[PDB]
Design a protein around this ligand. Structure first.
Ligand SMILES: CC(C)(COP(=O)(O)OP(=O)(O)OC[C@H]1O[C@@H](n2cnc3c(N)ncnc32)[C@H](O)[C@@H]1OP(=O)(O)O)[C@@H](O)C(=O)NCCC(=O)NCCS
Ligand SMILES: [Ca+2]
Ligand SMILES: [Cl-]
Ligand SMILES: [Cl-]
Ligand SMILES: [Cl-]
Length: 142
């Protein structure tokens, strides 16, 4: 009998390696609204040593961090693109992630897009799908 395994096929060690090594995060869909999940996860990641660049062309600053209108506008290397936007918006952000030389595209709950995941894979990025960075951090490293 096999148990529910994650759709992205990554082991707990694979996720642990990502969470340990890749800490330059572009958090797409960042929001200053305390009720938004993007706000909660951004606050958590900042508390745990992540360098979190908010990405949302609507805002100039989120949680005291300069907020950028695209992943490509960030003046630093970016390792993980952490997605908090609706599925169809993720295609453009994956294209930006590829151009930026990011290593990991991370689909948070309710953001998964098959075509975007396809592009990431073909470009050699790691895909994390239907997981939360905060929940995975709490579970594996907390
Ligand atoms: C994807 C998700 C954000 C959709 O929720 P929703 O209520 O429909 O919200 P919307 O997508 O309309 O808007 C969310 C934010 O996206 C931002 N957004 C919209 N278009 C954007 C774009 N092109 N680029 C960057 N951000 C954008 C908006 O500004 C908005 O923030 P605001 O409310 O401060 O303006 C929601 O399902 C998400 O929170 N999923 C992740 C949940 C989960 O992983 N939580 C973890 C808990 S452990
Ligand atoms: Ca494009
Ligand atoms: Cl996938
Ligand atoms: Cl604004
Ligand atoms: Cl704020």
């Amino acid at each position: 009998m096999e148990e529910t395994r994650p759709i992205d096929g990554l082991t707990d060690e694979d996720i642990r390696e990502i969470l340990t090594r890749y800490k330059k995060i572009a958090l797409v869909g960042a929001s200053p609204k305390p009720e938004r999940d993007a706000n909660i996860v951004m606050k958590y990641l900042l508390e745990h040593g992540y360098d979190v660049y908010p990405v949302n062309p609507k805002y100039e600053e989120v949680l005291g961090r300069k907020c950028y209108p695209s992943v490509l506008d960030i003046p630093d290397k970016i390792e993980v693109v952490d997605l908090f936007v609706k599925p169809k918006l993720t295609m453009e952000y994956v294209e930006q992630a590829i151009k930026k030389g990011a290593k990991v595209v991370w689909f948070q709950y309710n953001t998964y897009n098959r075509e975007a995941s396809k592009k990431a894979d073909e470009a050699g990025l790691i895909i994390v799908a239907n997981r939360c960075m905060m929940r995975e951090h709490e579970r594996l490293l907390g």
